[PDB]
Design an enzyme around this catalytic site. Structure first.
Site, PDB file in Angstrom:
ATOM      1  N   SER A  47       0.583  -1.059   0.040  1.00 52.89           N
ATOM      2  CA  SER A  47       0.068   0.057  -0.022  1.00 52.89           C
ATOM      3  C   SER A  47       0.839   1.172  -0.113  1.00 52.89           C
ATOM      4  O   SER A  47       0.398   2.360  -0.438  1.00 52.89           O
ATOM      5  CB  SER A  47      -1.368  -0.370   1.549  1.00 52.89           C
ATOM      6  OG  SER A  47      -2.126  -0.958   1.057  1.00 52.89           O
ATOM      7  N   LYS A  50       0.687   3.820  -3.076  1.00 55.94           N
ATOM      8  CA  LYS A  50      -0.864   4.232  -3.346  1.00 55.94           C
ATOM      9  C   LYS A  50      -0.358   5.778  -3.648  1.00 55.94           C
ATOM     10  O   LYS A  50      -1.564   6.587  -4.193  1.00 55.94           O
ATOM     11  CB  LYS A  50      -1.503   4.562  -1.869  1.00 55.94           C
ATOM     12  CG  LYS A  50      -2.231   3.032  -1.990  1.00 55.94           C
ATOM     13  CD  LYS A  50      -4.201   3.143  -1.239  1.00 55.94           C
ATOM     14  CE  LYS A  50      -4.546   1.779  -0.368  1.00 55.94           C
ATOM     15  NZ  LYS A  50      -3.648   0.688  -0.694  1.00 55.94           N
ATOM     16  N   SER A  95      -5.757   2.698   3.492  1.00 52.49           N
ATOM     17  CA  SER A  95      -5.495   2.291   3.225  1.00 52.49           C
ATOM     18  C   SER A  95      -6.809   0.687   1.774  1.00 52.49           C
ATOM     19  O   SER A  95      -6.876  -0.054   2.022  1.00 52.49           O
ATOM     20  CB  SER A  95      -4.739   1.294   3.205  1.00 52.49           C
ATOM     21  OG  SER A  95      -3.760   1.383   3.182  1.00 52.49           O
ATOM     22  N   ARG A 227       5.490   0.286  13.689  1.00 47.82           N
ATOM     23  CA  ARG A 227       6.158   1.120  12.938  1.00 47.82           C
ATOM     24  C   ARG A 227       6.145   2.191  13.232  1.00 47.82           C
ATOM     25  O   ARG A 227       7.638   2.542  12.742  1.00 47.82           O
ATOM     26  CB  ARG A 227       5.488   0.823  11.498  1.00 47.82           C
ATOM     27  CG  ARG A 227       5.364  -0.850  11.100  1.00 47.82           C
ATOM     28  CD  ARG A 227       3.957  -0.863   9.676  1.00 47.82           C
ATOM     29  NE  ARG A 227       2.841  -0.944  10.417  1.00 47.82           N
ATOM     30  CZ  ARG A 227       1.673   0.026   9.238  1.00 47.82           C
ATOM     31  NH1 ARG A 227       1.590  -0.174   8.486  1.00 47.82           N
ATOM     32  NH2 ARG A 227       0.727  -0.284  10.251  1.00 47.82           N
TER      33      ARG A 227
HETATM   34  O1  LIG Z   1      -1.189  -0.680   7.325  1.00 44.85           O
HETATM   35  C1  LIG Z   1      -1.608  -0.949   6.279  1.00 44.85           C
HETATM   36  O2  LIG Z   1      -1.481   0.632   5.732  1.00 44.85           O
HETATM   37  C2  LIG Z   1      -2.430  -1.948   5.739  1.00 44.85           C
HETATM   38  C3  LIG Z   1      -3.305  -2.109   7.159  1.00 44.85           C
HETATM   39  C4  LIG Z   1      -3.651  -1.293   8.226  1.00 44.85           C
HETATM   40  N1  LIG Z   1      -3.242  -0.917   8.601  1.00 44.85           N
HETATM   41  C5  LIG Z   1      -4.236   0.968   7.786  1.00 44.85           C
HETATM   42  C6  LIG Z   1      -3.535   2.268   8.104  1.00 44.85           C
HETATM   43  C7  LIG Z   1      -2.841   1.341   9.736  1.00 44.85           C
HETATM   44  N2  LIG Z   1      -2.736   0.270   9.187  1.00 44.85           N
HETATM   45  C8  LIG Z   1      -4.184  -2.936   6.088  1.00 44.85           C
HETATM   46  C9  LIG Z   1      -4.812  -3.618   5.248  1.00 44.85           C
HETATM   47  C10 LIG Z   1      -3.626  -2.948   4.143  1.00 44.85           C
HETATM   48  C11 LIG Z   1      -2.726  -2.104   4.185  1.00 44.85           C
HETATM   49  O3  LIG Z   1      -2.252  -1.723   3.287  1.00 44.85           O
HETATM   50  B1  LIG Z   1      -1.239  -2.231   1.923  1.00 44.85           B
HETATM   51  O4  LIG Z   1      -1.000  -3.063   2.179  1.00 44.85           O
HETATM   52  C12 LIG Z   1      -3.059  -3.210   2.009  1.00 44.85           C
HETATM   53  O5  LIG Z   1      -3.687  -3.784   2.875  1.00 44.85           O
END
Ligand code: A1EG0
Length: 242
Positions: A47, A50, A95, A227
């Site tokens: 992600s 993005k 995300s 993180r």
């Molecule tokens: O770490 C991510 O951004 C994230 C998370 C957890 N998260 C979201 C906001 C903060 N933590 C869950 C699923 C996911 C994610 O990113 B990607 O790589 C797609 O799927």
């Protein structure tokens, strides 16, 4: 240009964790890391992809501005924040993969490939599914290579419009107060081994900017909070934040 500081390993150790943090001081043009080898190994972006995918969609009109609405398709998914409508801001924050898979379809792979070579992004390789190569295809990038791309974005030097770059930087906003501003993006890669988490971005001060990129081993969802916690321990040891 590059220095290794292994004292920072104490912050991974005390959490029973393995990973890397990389920093870059923009005024002085100096880089710092706890592990120079891992700083220069390539992983799936997940992600964190993005950021460039947003830039490309805006420069092409797929996304018209940051208020345009992408309404829930009605399919229930295991992440609960994803089952609602979103705009560019909330879709970055939570995300929301299926919103960005739809963008990638619209863009198609001749134009996706073209923009990534212009950006000099990672290994520039989009092999796999047009709408999931960043989660289980052939694209790879290192922590030092994340920093070089983000410096171009900070200075509006990418080969897209100024307006596109300003909108993406707005949507990266994560934290701010009287001492600092953070613009950043999380990632969680779980489809191909090894499972890892990412956090990449920068810290704006009154008189300097410190770019950062980190990744770490993530066998279980339980350590996602580390993180940010480990990254901020490095920043405080170096007197960058209070
Ligand atoms: O770490 C991510 O951004 C994230 C998370 C957890 N998260 C979201 C906001 C903060 N933590 C869950 C699923 C996911 C994610 O990113 B990607 O790589 C797609 O799927």
């Amino acid at each position: 240009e590059w220095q290794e500081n292994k004292s920072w390993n104490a912050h991974f150790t005390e959490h029973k964790s393995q990973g890397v943090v990389v920093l870059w001081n923009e005024n002085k043009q100096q880089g710092f890391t706890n592990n120079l080898k891992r700083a220069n190994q390539a992983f799936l972006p997940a992600s964190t992809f993005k950021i460039p995918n947003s830039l490309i969609a805006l420069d092409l009109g797929v996304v018209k501005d940051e208020h345009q609405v992408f309404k829930w398709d009605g399919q229930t998914r295991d992440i609960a924040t994803w089952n609602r409508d979103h705009n560019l801001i909330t879709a970055m924050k939570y995300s929301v993969v299926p919103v960005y898979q739809e963008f990638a379809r619209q863009i198609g792979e001749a134009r996706m490939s073209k923009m990534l070579h212009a950006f000099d992004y990672g290994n520039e390789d989009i092999s796999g599914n047009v709408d999931s190569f960043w989660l289980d295809g052939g694209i790879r990038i290192s922590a030092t290579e994340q920093i070089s791309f983000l410096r171009k974005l900070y200075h509006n030097k990418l080969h897209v419009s100024e307006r596109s770059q300003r909108i993406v930087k707005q949507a990266m906003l994560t934290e701010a107060n009287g001492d600092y501003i953070i613009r950043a993006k999380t990632g969680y890669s779980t489809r191909i081994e090894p499972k890892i988490g990412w956090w990449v971005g920068w810290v704006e001060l009154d008189d300097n900017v410190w770019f950062f990129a980190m990744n770490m081993d993530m066998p279980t969802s339980d350590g996602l909070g580390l993180r940010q916690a480990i990254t901020k321990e490095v920043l405080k040891q170096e007197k960058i934040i209070p």
